[PDB]
Amino acid sequence: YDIYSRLLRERIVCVMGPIDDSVASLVIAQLLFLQSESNKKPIHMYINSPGGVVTAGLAIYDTMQYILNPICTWCVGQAASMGSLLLAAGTPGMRHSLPNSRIMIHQAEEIMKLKKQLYNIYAKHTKQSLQVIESAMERDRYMSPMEAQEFGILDKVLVHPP
Amino acid sequence: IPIVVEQGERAYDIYSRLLRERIVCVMGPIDDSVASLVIAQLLFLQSESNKKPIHMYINSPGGVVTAGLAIYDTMQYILNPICTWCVGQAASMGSLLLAAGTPGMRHSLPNSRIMIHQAEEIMKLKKQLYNIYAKHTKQSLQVIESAMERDRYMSPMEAQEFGILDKVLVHPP
Amino acid sequence: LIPIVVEQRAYDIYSRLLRERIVCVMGPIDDSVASLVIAQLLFLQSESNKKPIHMYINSPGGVVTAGLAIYDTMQYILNPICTWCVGQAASMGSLLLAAGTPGMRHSLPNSRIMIHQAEEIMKLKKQLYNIYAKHTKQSLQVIESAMERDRYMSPMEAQEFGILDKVLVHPP
Amino acid sequence: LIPIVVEQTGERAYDIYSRLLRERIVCVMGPIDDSVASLVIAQLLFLQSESNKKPIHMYINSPGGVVTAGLAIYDTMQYILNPICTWCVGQAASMGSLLLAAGTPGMRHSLPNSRIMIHQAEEIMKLKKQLYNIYAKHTKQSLQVIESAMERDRYMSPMEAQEFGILDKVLVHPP
Amino acid sequence: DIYSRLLRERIVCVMGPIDDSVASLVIAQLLFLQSESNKKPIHMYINSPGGVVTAGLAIYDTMQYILNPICTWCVGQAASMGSLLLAAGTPGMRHSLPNSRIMIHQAEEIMKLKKQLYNIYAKHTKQSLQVIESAMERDRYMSPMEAQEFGILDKVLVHP
Amino acid sequence: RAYDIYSRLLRERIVCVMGPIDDSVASLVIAQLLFLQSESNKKPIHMYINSPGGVVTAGLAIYDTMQYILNPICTWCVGQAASMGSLLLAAGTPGMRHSLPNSRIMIHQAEEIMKLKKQLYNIYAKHTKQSLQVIESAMERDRYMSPMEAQEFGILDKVLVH
Amino acid sequence: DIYSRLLRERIVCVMGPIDDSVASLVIAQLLFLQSESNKKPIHMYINSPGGVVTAGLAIYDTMQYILNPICTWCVGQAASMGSLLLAAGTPGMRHSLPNSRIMIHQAEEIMKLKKQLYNIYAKHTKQSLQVIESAMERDRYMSPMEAQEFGILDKVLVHP
Known part of the structure; x- marks a missing residue:
């Protein structure tokens, strides 16, 4: 087995490295x-x-x-x-x-429409308002996971789990 | 590419396992291969x-x-x-x-993007696409001919009104 | 590559079709x-x-x-x-x-058919005329001129030219 | 890729180039390399x-x-x-x-549509002289005829090759 | 592959360069x-x-x-x-x-990342930050008998 | 291709040694x-x-x-x-x-170079049963020899003549 | 592969140049x-x-x-x-x-590394260190039955 195949057999899916059509x-x-x-x-x-x-x-x-x-x-x-x-x-x-992950939400006219879709789906999952997400997504900063939990991306930060 | 092993001990490429659910993935560019x-x-x-x-x-x-x-x-x-x-x-x-x-x-x-925009053999080939869109979308040739001329994506809820889609699904019933 | 299973190289689809007596010739026809x-x-x-x-x-x-x-x-x-x-x-x-x-x-019904194409290459091209005249029943002069024009033709024409027996949108 | 065809015995798999050996068919196809x-x-x-x-x-x-x-x-x-x-x-x-x-x-x-052509140091000269001798044994053409014909760079049709003596029949169908 | 056949014995070979893959x-x-x-x-x-x-x-x-x-x-x-x-x-x-060789030596965000390395070396080697900050500038391999007293490793061992 | 065929032949205990001999x-x-x-x-x-x-x-x-x-x-x-x-x-x-029958055979090719030459003479004399001086008297001559000569010289036992 | 079948026989092949790969x-x-x-x-x-x-x-x-x-x-x-x-x-x-060819002959850092090789030859060959100093200098291959007397080998064998 490759490790991703040995994990898949127990219902764990890995998306690691860049995301592309492949x-x-x-x-x-x-x-x-x-x-x-x-x-x-x-x-x-x-x-x-x-x-x-x-x-x-x-x-x-x-x-x-x-x-x-x-x-x-x-x-x-x-x-x-x-x-x-x-x-x-x-x-x-x-x-x-x-505990010490690095999380960042910042990244044609159709691209502007597509970016507007991202604000809506962040608003659904983070429960932040559109103006909060529009302003928060403007800054190139890696938020620490204890801050991302307060923004709403994370439900808990884990250290030393059972 | 992930593999999964059934209880013989056949090992399947993940696309070959999905083929047993009769699922055909066509992803990335369409080409001769x-x-x-x-x-x-x-x-x-x-x-x-x-x-x-x-x-x-x-x-x-x-x-x-x-x-x-x-x-x-x-x-x-x-x-x-x-x-x-x-x-x-x-x-x-x-x-x-x-x-x-x-x-x-x-x-x-719902977050998909649909678009129908694209020798004389290119003209005689283009006029095949208009006919098969008119067959499957039930639009007239003039509507397809104008709709294939604009370089835009259309949202899937527009494409359902244009007739390309039957339904747009979330949390399937 | 191709969807595969280990047979217990791998058992690709083009082999797994071959059991059903289906031969795919797809892509260019080269010596390989x-x-x-x-x-x-x-x-x-x-x-x-x-x-x-x-x-x-x-x-x-x-x-x-x-x-x-x-x-x-x-x-x-x-x-x-x-x-x-x-x-x-x-x-x-x-x-x-x-x-x-x-x-x-x-x-x-949407396939596009085209027949267009040292001394040995000329007599070999003359061999193509004979085998097209054999199967299409067109005369050699019709084949020699139909191979002269660089066009694709629709398969409704190809029936009239004699290459096809039937176009099939849906099988009987 | 060569078709890996699978046959029930557990399962075992053969390349068609090897599965044909069940019928004693030897395909020599493509260039003749050392391999x-x-x-x-x-x-x-x-x-x-x-x-x-x-x-x-x-x-x-x-x-x-x-x-x-x-x-x-x-x-x-x-x-x-x-x-x-x-x-x-x-x-x-x-x-x-x-x-x-x-x-x-x-x-x-x-x-009938085949193409046949016999044309292509002291050791190399003696090697080529060996080719003329074996063509003279198998084609029954005299040595001078092969030495003259084997320098001409042309293909010959199978009907010409039949009368030259390379082969014994040209067949459309086995019967 | 042997790297997966070793995994059955809970051995992780981290060998070759470290990269995102x-x-x-x-x-x-x-x-x-x-x-x-x-x-x-x-x-x-x-x-x-x-x-x-x-x-x-x-x-x-x-x-x-x-x-x-x-x-x-x-x-x-x-x-x-x-x-x-x-x-x-x-x-x-x-x-x-005993024959292995060890080296600790190698836009503000990259300096903040370098500062994070100093803290974690100080946590595990128990050296003070001023020692590691200086020692990390020396482009010089340290032998295991030096690395043990610097605190990276606990013992050098053959035939456990 | 070529490095597939040699793998196929391992299934029948045939070892191809073909092309120039080198460490690869x-x-x-x-x-x-x-x-x-x-x-x-x-x-x-x-x-x-x-x-x-x-x-x-x-x-x-x-x-x-x-x-x-x-x-x-x-x-x-x-x-x-x-x-x-x-x-x-x-x-x-x-x-x-x-x-x-028409394969071609040839035995011909610092103090270490003499010592390398000298051990080749010993192993040729072992397997051919010719005396070492007979090996030298042959191995100095640069010619190919037919298998019917190699058989009588003693490099091989059988020519596949039938 | 061949080498990963030989691994079943507990046979390890060190074939070709010994590189980091x-x-x-x-x-x-x-x-x-x-x-x-x-x-x-x-x-x-x-x-x-x-x-x-x-x-x-x-x-x-x-x-x-x-x-x-x-x-x-x-x-x-x-x-x-x-x-x-x-x-x-x-x-x-x-x-x-019997026909194999054996050779032991190959800055401050390079000297400090090379002084490992003399010690790890010396303790395995049972040779005095000053002998390795003058034996590792000559660019020559040596015959197996000479290497046995030098102590690099225990047996020279035609058949197992």
Whole structure:
């Protein structure tokens, strides 16, 4: 086994490295397979992404919302913008992080429309208002996970779990 | 690429395991080497049964028109219902395959982006696309001819009004 | 690469189709394909002398001396070969289509067919005229002039030219 | 990729180039490299062990190859006691034509659209003199005719090759 | 592959350079090994010429998040981030083979990241920050008999 | 292709030693030889030789391994066997040395260079049963020899003439 | 592969140059073979023109960390680091084939490294250090039956 295959057999999906149309092809292909294995047993997603193609990240995020399984989503290492979206899109209550991860939400006229979609989906998952997200997404800063938990991306920060 | 091992001890490429759910992924550009590969999958799945629907997941920015029409023709010749899902984006030929799914079961996801914009043989080829859009979208040729001229993406809830989609799904019932 | 399973290299789809007697010739017909399709066809003959072989053609062109190697193997084999045109059938890809068993040369309705193409290359081009005149029943002067024009033609024309027996949007 | 065809025994898998050995079909196709010569030498000597007298069918489609590689194949065709039937499909050019000519007499065949061509230091001169002698043995042409014909760089049709004596029948269908 | 066949014995070979691909691959393994038990140690054999600080810190924090005793063996070489992972092994169980060679030596955000390295070396080596800040400027390998007294590793060992 | 065929032939205990002998080849033939011993201590192994020569320090690595292995090793000369290629032919198990009738054989090629030459004379005298002076009297002459001469000289036992 | 089948026989091949890439792979095979059996010998066949010293010392230390008897067979040539690994096999079963060629001959940091090699030859060959000083200077290969008297070998064998 490759370790990602040995993890997949226990319903843990890894999205690590940059997100692109090929990585999306793999992460969608796993996600909807683990639905056919069971419609109840939660799926775990581990995030370690320096960014990605915006229309690939929305392909993964839409699939995560389409699937009926609870998806417990773990920030491991860093979650730059297009990973931070997926981290936020975990099932509410099971968006975990390591203690010293690095989280950042900052990154044609159609691109402006697409950016406007990101503000809406952050507003749904973080419960912040649109102006808070629009202003917060302007700054190139890695927020620490204890701050990201207060912004609303994370439900808890884990150290020394059972 | 992940593998999964069934209890013999067959090890499946994750796409080959999904093929057992009759799921065909077509993601990334359509070209002579993906149309060759998706037609082979389609012709295989028709052999395992004539009745059971095939689910086709599209995420492609476009592709070679004479390859996209090879997949489309195979989707018509086959007797299976082909549920078509447009996860991510579908642009140009990627939107044709989405139009070509079985009427009533062409699905899409709300944050997808759909677009139908693209010798004399290029003109005589272009006039094929207008006819098959007029067949599957039920729009008139003049509407397709104008709608294929504007370089924009349309949101999936617009495309359902244009008739490319049957339904836009969240938390499926 | 291709969807695979370990057999217990890997058991790809193009092999997993071969059990159903389906031969794909897709992409260009070169010496590496031609030396391969004539290996598949010979294997399918010994599994059954009578059961048809289905051959799906999507070729934008090919090496003339490779396309004639596949073509003559298709005549040597006793099996009825049913040739399906899906997408391109241009240059040698249209010969293999025309070489399918009389009555079972099929095309899907949006495929584009084209027959257009030292001394040895001229007499070899003259060999193409003879085999097109054999299968299409057009006279040599009609073939020699129809190969002169650089156009694709719709498969409704290809029936009138005689390359196809039937176009099929949906199977009977 | 060569089709890996799977056959029930547990499961086992054979390349079609090896699955054909169930019917004693030896495909020599593409250029005759040292590796391709190594395969067909091993493959021919194996078939003699399964039966001493049942025919072998060899299908030739070669544009040419290394002179000392094709002679390595040709010598096994002379050592082996099996009748070998040689089918030329596509083209048999340069040393690929020797293998066609070396099939057992009366059962050298080629398909009507084929192309045949016999044309291609003291050790190299003596090697080429060996080729003329073996062509004179198998084609029954006199040495001067082969020495003159083997310098001409043209293909010949299978109907010309039949009267030149490289092959014994041109056949559309097996019957 | 042998690197996965070793995994059955809870051995993590972190060998070659540390990069974002390899850092992902080791924190995949560590988190898997923590699922199979919370109790049994993990053995980590380090042979790294160096690595990307943004990746060597990803491995390191998983080694602190995991409760398993991680026993780190320096085999051959441990330089730059490879030296941190050796230092981050569980106190008392950091080991080095006698011929291995160790080196700690290698826009404001990059200086803040460098300041984070000084704090974690001070936590695990117990040296004061002014010692590590100076010592990290010396482009010089230290032998295991020096690294033991500098505090990176606890014992040099053959035939345990 | 070429490096696939050699793998296919391992399934029938045939070892191709082809092209010039160098450390990139000798480190592979001795690896195959040791593998094919472990599959059976008594099943024969077939060397297929088609090599024009090479570096002596690689060809002696194969030769020593062919003496260490307990299997009977058949040596088939196919194509040509010159220099080190002819040594590996001679080193086959007595009675198992075969050659194709028009294959071409050649034995001809600091104080260490003399010492390297002197050990070649010893191993040729061992396997050919010719006296060392008879080896020198032949090995100084640069010619190819026919297998029917090599048989009577004693490099090989059988020519595949029938 | 061949080498990953030989791993089933407890046979390890050090073939070609000993670089950091292959050292990272013989250490993995060695540490794996210890886990399958702590007692059954490992046979290591050496054919190395040489190598980078900071990789040959990584294989060598792993050969000392492992408790298995390691039988080192010199096949072809063992020059430079290849000769160290040959000398490192467990006393009494370092073996050589009769035509193989053995050679031990190969700044402040380079001197401080090279003084390791003299000590780790000296204690394995039972030679006085001043002999290695004048034996490692001559650029010559030496015959196996000379290397046996110099102490690099235990047996020269035609057949096992």
